[PDB]
Design a protein around this ligand. Structure first.
Ligand SMILES: NC(=O)c1cnc(C(F)(F)F)nc1
Length: 152
């Protein structure tokens, strides 16, 4: 049947919100009050892929935009990008692998691993107003843990 999707926001474990930073760029910053309207709302689709109790394959599209987070090699490195798609054809249950993240629940937090690039994760910096990026460890100074908020 159709693909099932939920509207949501994400915040990193330091409670930074995600906003735009150009036509295809996301940054993370501390946000509260009026400025919270600036945060990106995702449509999280539950897609085809290997699945277990705590590891759920999803795609992350921007709400009512034909833009998806994707993982590709750029200048020979696994990188995160926002990629446009044909709005007639998306979302779909069989999303291409570059669009698929494994949403992993550990200790009441979420990690989003690239399905395409094992052990590469959606990451934020500790500094304010820096890009969201794909980081090659769920270790170290960069942040790989998030919480989800459900949106109407
Ligand atoms: N400048 C970056 O490292 C960067 C990568 N990826 C993104 C995305 F896809 F979240 F929007 N925004 C910025």
């Amino acid at each position: 049947a159709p693909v099932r999707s939920l509207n949501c926001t994400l915040r990193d474990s330091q409670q930074k919100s995600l906003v735009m930073s150009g036509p295809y760029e996301l940054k993370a910053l501390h946000l509260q009050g009026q400025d919270m309207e600036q945060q990106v709302v995702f449509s999280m689709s539950f897609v085809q892929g290997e699945e277990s109790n705590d590891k759920i394959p999803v795609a992350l599209g921007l709400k009512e935009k034909n833009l998806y987070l994707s993982c590709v090699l750029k200048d020979d490195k696994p990188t995160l990008q926002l990629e446009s798609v044909d709005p007639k054809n998306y979302p779909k249950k069989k999303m291409e692998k570059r669009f698929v993240f494994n949403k992993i629940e550990i200790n009441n937090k979420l990690e989003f691993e690239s399905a395409q690039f094992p052990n590469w994760y959606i990451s934020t910096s500790q500094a304010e107003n820096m890009p969201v990026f794909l980081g090659g460890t769920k270790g170290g100074q960069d942040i790989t843990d998030f919480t989800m908020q459900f949106v109407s």
